Amino acid sequence: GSSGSSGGGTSNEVAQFLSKENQVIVRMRGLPFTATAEEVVAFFGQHCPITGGKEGILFVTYPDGRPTGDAFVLFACEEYAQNALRKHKDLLGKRYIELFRSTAAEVQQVLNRFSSASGPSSG
Questions:
Q1: Can you give the residue ranges of every domain in the chain?
Q2: In this protein, which residues make up the domain named RRM?
Q3: In terms of CATH, what superfamily is 1-123?
Q4: What angle is formed at CA 58 by the lines to CA 52 and CA 64, rounded to 5 degrees?
Q5: For a tag on the chain, would you pick the N or C end, based on fewer CB atoms within 10 A?
């Protein structure tokens, strides 16, 4: 009997994503249903390279298998993350996207809320 549903909202994939220390996480919202890790890599790959690229990206998806729209990216230091923030309200493939420097803890709270949603409304 191994626990998983109740006891720390962190998947195997996330572990590695959060396992990265000294990195600036970015909360991406409003991402094209078609936009994938590959799309991001280039998005910031311009001047703001991601740590591991496809490996340094996490797409938040409902506990059923649906694109929630929100996501998270990894950045070596604040030198890249910041420069990326300026891209706020960017445009990828004809789709406006926001940007906000997020933290590790926050992320987890953003995954649990969507995972096994207990509302899904928050009261």
A1: 1-123
A2: 24-104
A3: RRM (RNA recognition motif) domain (3.30.70.330)
A4: 150
A5: N
